[PDB]
Amino acid sequence: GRKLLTYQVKQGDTLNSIAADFRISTAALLQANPSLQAGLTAGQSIVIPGLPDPYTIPYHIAVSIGAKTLTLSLNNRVMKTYPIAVGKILTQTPTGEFYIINRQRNPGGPFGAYWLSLSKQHYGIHGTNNPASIGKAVSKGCIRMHNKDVIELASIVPNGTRVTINRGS
Template sequence: MDFRMSVPSLMAANPGLKPNQIIAGTTIVIPGIRNPATIPYHVIIHLDQKILQLYHSGRLMKTYPIAVGKILTATPSGDFVVVNREPNPGGPFGAYWLSLSKLHYGIHGTNNPLSIGKAVSKGCVRMYNQDVVELASIIPNGTRVSIRS
């Protein structure tokens, strides 16, 4: 996973841990990101249905329509977390950007609302601007995001 921070920042948050000790499966503290297990929210994205579902404590709160990656630039399946965010990122990213722990991928708004419901992106998940702003106001960094086929 990529948490978009320097090794010195990670080392400062994890005293006694050496850079060569950080391997897959190592539990570490990520500054500014809560432990995903302590967050009651969970986002599940269904690529085939082109929907994003927001859960709170295991109960479905809301379902949003989305756009996903096209065949040559498919949205990756897997389990990720929201690692950072940016309101009004500009360009094609619409009103909000929620960065995922997979480098270069995120959930964002769009300047092309007609794309929602289609497989047209370069791999990111697009939402209507009002929907992504609502989602960003609810979920904190560290929220689990499961992307399924």
């Protein structure tokens, strides 16, 4: 067996939402969790195929809303911290504990040499071509970084790494 990343359902989650959120297939999420098709359960752990275990990962990321920052730690111990951007969509969760689902290396467009996808659709870490929006709070746009920084995380941390969206202070 493989060490994969789990999800704990909230009351009224959707199979196809989580397959949109983790950029997976509901057919694969049903493949990993035959219970989902039948119905959903709040607090039900459902796994994400293709996405490994965050607790095998040596790094941890802390996203501070109140600061607009991204902390790259190693074994909980901070290595670095990169500036990032937060849209009003992240402001919703005061705990925002999430996980990098997978990555998209240089798309080509302004998406900041990379698009590292998060466990929630709008919760996502990517680069930009307008760096002066970095460190800032934006209307909706998801957590933007700088190109060399979004490529850092992309080379340093693997998928499954936990990105903690904290309102902070």
